[PDB]
């Protein structure tokens, strides 16, 4: 097994120079061996990916999936540790930069079928990972307008060269 996500919180950066932009705080948290399918957890992770901590908590509090409660607990723990240990000034000033579900260590069981035959069940377990970044959530990538789209087309036209000649 690998546990690099936990270690990711132990990296210490050198002191920043006064004439340097303030480095946003990053907090890595995870929960291991959740009795939940990673495929099902991925939908919740994608849902809360890129949102602010408060918005993610709000969505999870009212989503009906079982993994929603687990992710809410993980996010609350992440917020608490970010405030206590990672010197994050404001609780609400955090957004989910990364949220993914990983396969856990699963157990194999037997499912009995009709004619003395069987299948191999898998008591599925999954991991859950979050990175919380201090600061307002990055603005959503605006859809490319017709102006920019035509600009790209014209750039493609201009890039044309006389191929296969001097």
């Amino acid at each position: 097994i690998s546990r690099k996500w936990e270690k990711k919180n132990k990296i210490v950066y050198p002191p920043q120079l006064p004439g340097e932009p303030r480095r946003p705080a990053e907090i890595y948290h995870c929960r291991r061996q959740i009795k939940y399918s990673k495929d099902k957890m991925w939908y919740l992770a994608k849902l809360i990916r890129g949102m602010s901590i408060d918005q993610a908590l709000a969505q999870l509090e009212f989503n009906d999936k079982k993994g929603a409660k687990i992710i809410k607990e993980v996010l609350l723990e992440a917020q608490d540790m970010a405030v206590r240990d990672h010197n994050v000034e404001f609780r609400s000033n955090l957004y989910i930069a990364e949220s993914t579900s990983g396969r856990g260590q699963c157990l194999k069981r037997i499912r009995y079928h009709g004619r003395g035959r069987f299948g191999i069940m898998e008591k599925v377990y999954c991991h859950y990972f979050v990175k919380l970044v201090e600061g307002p959530p990055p603005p959503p990538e605006p859809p490319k307008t017709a102006v920019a789209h035509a600009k790209e087309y014209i750039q493609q036209l201009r890039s044309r060269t006389i191929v296969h000649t001097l």
Binding site: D39, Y43, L44, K46, L47, L57, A58, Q59, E61, F62, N63, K65
Partner: protein
Amino acid sequence: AAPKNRRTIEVNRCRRRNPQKLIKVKNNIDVCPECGHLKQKHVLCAYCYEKVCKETAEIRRQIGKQEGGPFKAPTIETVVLYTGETPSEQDQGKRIIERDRKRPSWFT
């Protein structure tokens, strides 16, 4: 019928990440003015409803203690009175349920 070929991870990703599959963001969530916890606009506040349910459970337990057994539902109205409260003229002739606590502010 059995699969004729294994579907690739590309096709599977397409199918299972199609926005029809993805969870929809809910924009009907709002803050409860009473307690400040989150609530869906049409749904009742969970925190406030739990407060009311716990107070109702206490009142109902007192009701059961006073009734003393099954099939003893009163034939008169009921009034809940808290510590430091006396029955009013309207409350006269009504079964009094006494609660050993101060009247909740929300309760009236």
